[PDB]
């Protein structure tokens, strides 16, 4: 007889072969999106599937996974597992999470659903839609995971609301709107490749393993059950830039470009995580510095070592970002410290054996630059003079983070940058943020800067506090302010 099909071939007939050359409509009207970014795709049928689960397999695996995770959520809730966390300070990491990271889950569901329509290759479509509904799973799942903590702690009760509005959440809100507004080659590149491949561990492990080291059972279960999901997301990511670089030499400079952009946008987003893991986990996992060093400097080093063969090189300014692993987390925490009158999580001075640790993970920078800060701040708090800065900060036109970052090799100088464009001035956290601006200035001048919008009166209130309570929904006295004094702390001292 004729040849039985092999694995690859069988999967293609169960996906790609369903598609077909259109006859009654033009192809480009059906797929109108694949040209304006300037990416040329020579041959679609040379596409390699990143994974090969048919529907009945996906459904079967994912059902069995889900069943195990809701049993554990159910149990966790019925025994009040929240009481076993290491200490209520840890919950601020979940507040930052469900307001900050979790709505990104949903913007991905949204984004990949789209791109999973607009790609002409039927297989690029299934990988994406598959990713799409995974991200929807991630989003719903976190909502349940978090449900019980929401019932016992402050800060978590209006995630979606605050994501669209609260200043600091505009850092991740804007990241994603950047990508979803781009075209679909760049979306794949920013998210699958840049976020889901190069940076994914740098965001995932610190929360996931933070919860493990801190007695948070429901969140770590969500993590474990997400691994097999991420396995597929990462392969999609790395296949797909290999594919784009391969399908034409002119694709190359355009992709390089996207790499430098989204590495830098992602590095910047991540800085919230840096802080989270160094300052917010009562029990430490690893420093931000060792987390950068291992998952970016080494893993990413190797990743790029392999893409050299496509004429790709490692992202602009990575040396800035490496030099910053010794600072990032301390710089972020003082910022949030001094503005947490406006955040939906608490901050605090860390414990002395926390500082000792920091001294030990940052032997070149903690004691020189950062420990003095807490010594001062602690004096001041003892005197009933706990620092709050009442004057809003300058924001970066691209990353939207306050301009707290410093010159490489000069940790004492703010690395500010300023340009004119169309007789309008704009301001930047860094060379990186600046380079992204100059490359697409017509995009970024549209940014809804939270600080700026507050002064425009666009945030229902004429005093920061009025904004915070009415617009932000952040309950003054409850969601707000130092950990010390907080309703969460008292409620924790009852419990224990």
């Amino acid at each position: 007889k004729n040849k039985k099909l092999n694995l690859k071939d069988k999967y293609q007939y169960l996906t790609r072969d369903m598609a077909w050359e259109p006859t009654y409509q033009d192809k480009k009207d059906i797929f109108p999106e694949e040209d304006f970014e300037g990416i040329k795709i020579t041959d679609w049928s040379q596409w390699e599937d990143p994974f090969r689960l048919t529907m009945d397999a996906y459904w079967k695996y994912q059902a069995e996974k889900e069943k195990k995770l809701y049993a554990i959520f159910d149990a966790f809730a019925q025994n009040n597992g929240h009481q076993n966390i290491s200490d209520a300070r840890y919950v601020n990491a979940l507040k930052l999470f469900i307001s900050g990271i979790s709505p990104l889950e949903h913007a991905a569901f949204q984004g990949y659903s789209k791109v999973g329509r607009q790609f002409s290759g039927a297989g690029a479509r299934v990988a994406c839609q598959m990713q799409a509904i995974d991200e929807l799973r991630h989003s719903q799942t976190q909502q349940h995971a978090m449900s019980h903590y929401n019932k016992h702690f402050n800060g978590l009760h209006d995630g979606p609301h605050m994501h669209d509005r609260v200043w600091y959440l505009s850092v991740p809100k804007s990241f994603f709107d950047d990508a979803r507004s781009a075209g679909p080659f760049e979306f794949l590149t920013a998210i699958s490749f840049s976020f889901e491949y190069v940076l994914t561990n740098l965001l995932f492990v610190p929360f996931m393993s933070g919860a493990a080291y801190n007695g948070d059972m429901a969140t770590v279960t969500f993590g474990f059950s997400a691994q097999s999901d991420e396995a597929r997301h990462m392969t999609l990511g790395l296949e797909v830039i290999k594919f784009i670089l391969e399908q034409h030499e002119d694709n190359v400079p355009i992709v390089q470009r996207w790499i430098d952009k989204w590495f830098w946008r992602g590095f910047r987003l991540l800085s919230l995580v840096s802080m989270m893991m160094d300052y917010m986990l009562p029990n430490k996992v690893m420093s931000w510095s060792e987390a950068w060093e291992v998952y970016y400097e080494q893993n990413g080093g190797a990743l790029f070592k392999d893409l050299e063969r496509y004429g790709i090189r490692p992202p602009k300014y990575q040396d800035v970002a490496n030099d910053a692993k010794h600072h990032l987390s301390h710089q972020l925490w003082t910022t949030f410290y001094q503005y947490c009158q406006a955040t939906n999580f608490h901050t605090w001075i860390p414990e002395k054996e926390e500082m000792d640790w920091m001294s030990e993970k940052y032997p070149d920078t903690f004691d020189k630059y950062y420990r003095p800060r807490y010594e001062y701040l602690a004096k001041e708090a003892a005197a009933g003079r706990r620092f709050y800065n009442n004057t809003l900060p300058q924001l970066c036109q691209v990353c939207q983070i306050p301009t707290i970052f410093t010159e490489k090799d000069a940790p004492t100088m703010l690395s500010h940058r300023q340009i004119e464009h169309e007789g309008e001035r704009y301001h930047f956290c860094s060379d990186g943020c600046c380079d992204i601006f100059k490359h697409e200035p017509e995009k970024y001048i549209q940014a809804w800067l939270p600080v700026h919008q507050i002064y425009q009166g666009n945030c229902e209130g004429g005093d920061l506090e009025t904004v915070v309570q009415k617009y932000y929904h952040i309950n003054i006295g409850e969601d707000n302010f130092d950990y010390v004094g907080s309703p969460d702390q008292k409620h924790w001292l009852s419990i224990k």
């Binding site: 809701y70 159910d74 809730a77 019925q78 025994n79």
Partner: protein
């Protein structure tokens, strides 16, 4: 006199509690460990008809069986009910 039924203090059991509260004007609830106890005079009941209009899909008794720790009483088992009682 008082028949009873403990359930897992569960997500699903909220609904199972519910339905038993609402077609037993008298049963009285009480919480504890990680569990719901429910007793009442001589008798309780569990209509499939209740439950269905509160879960948006058909369901049978036997699902309930999953989440019950302990019963108390003589059994009247159906496709339509779960009556638990003394003569």
């Amino acid at each position: 006199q008082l028949v009873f039924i403990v359930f897992q203090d569960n997500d699903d059991s909220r609904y199972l509690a519910e339905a038993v509260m609402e077609d037993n004007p008298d049963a009285e609830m009480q919480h504890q460990p990680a569990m719901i106890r429910i007793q009442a005079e001589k008798r309780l009941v569990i209509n499939r008809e209740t439950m269905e209009e509160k879960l948006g899909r058909d369901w049978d008794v036997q699902e309930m069986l999953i989440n019950v720790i302990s019963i108390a009483g003589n059994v009247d088992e159906d496709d339509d009910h779960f009556i638990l009682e003394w003569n």
